[PDB]
Amino acid sequence: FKKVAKETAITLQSALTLQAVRLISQQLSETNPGQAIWLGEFSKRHPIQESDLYLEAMMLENKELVLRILTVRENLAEGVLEFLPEMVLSQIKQSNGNHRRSLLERLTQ
Amino acid sequence: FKKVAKETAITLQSALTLQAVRLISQQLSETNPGQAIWLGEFSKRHPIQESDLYLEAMMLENKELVLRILTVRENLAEGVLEFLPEMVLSQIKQSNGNHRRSLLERLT
Numbered sequence A: 001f002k003k004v005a006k007e008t009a010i011t012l013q014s015a016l017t018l019q020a021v022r023l024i025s026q027q028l029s030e031t032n033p034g035q036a037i038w039l040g041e042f043s044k045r046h047p048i049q050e051s052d053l054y055l056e057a058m059m060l061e062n063k064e065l066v067l068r069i070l071t072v073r074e075n076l077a078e079g080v081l082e083f084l085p086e087m088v089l090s091q092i093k094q095s096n097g098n099h100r101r102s103l104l105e106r107l108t109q
Numbered sequence B: 001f002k003k004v005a006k007e008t009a010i011t012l013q014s015a016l017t018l019q020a021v022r023l024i025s026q027q028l029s030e031t032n033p034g035q036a037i038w039l040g041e042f043s044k045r046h047p048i049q050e051s052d053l054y055l056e057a058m059m060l061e062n063k064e065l066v067l068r069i070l071t072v073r074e075n076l077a078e079g080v081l082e083f084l085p086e087m088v089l090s091q092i093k094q095s096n097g098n099h100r101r102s103l104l105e106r107l108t
Helices: A001-029 A033-045 A051-058 A063-081 A085-108 B002-028 B034-044 B051-059 B062-076 B087-107
Strands: none
Touching: A001 A051, A001 A063, A001 B034, A001 B087, A051 B034, A051 B087, A063 B002, A063 B087, A085 B002, A085 B051, A085 B062, A085 B087, B002 B034, B002 B062, B051 B062, B051 B087
């Protein structure tokens, strides 16, 4: 259970980053929508999956926004990371259960 | 506050499944690679990012494997999920810092 710890954390990071870029997109829609469009199309040219390339990339077009994302992305993180393990594990079990119960019923019938 | 918390948790769920399917694929290559090759061939036609569907699919083609993934993905979860909130907050803080220097440097 070694490299998994790291690789997963990175996914999470990009996750929270996208998740931030998702709020900021909505707020933008209301306030400045010319920006909200830009953000969209820019999020089409650059995979949020690779977050750091993504942010650095933005630095050339919207320094101000890079910054906002950085804070939003950190807040959400605070507000969420702790509640996650007692939640993912739960769902894993519930998902694991339903799969096995349905995989065994399919054999039996 | 939490619609987020949910979606991330779904992502992690997907995430770990993938990570398990990887760890199993590795084992199969060192052993039963005729079927390690099959796993490549399956993972190709189906989106692992929607897990509960990737599995249901494989059910209808190789039951023994679905069952093993579920077993493996849950071991994984137990053995990693705790050191996670601490690892990600840390990394996010370390990145945010690095990105701000870089940005505020690039300004002048």
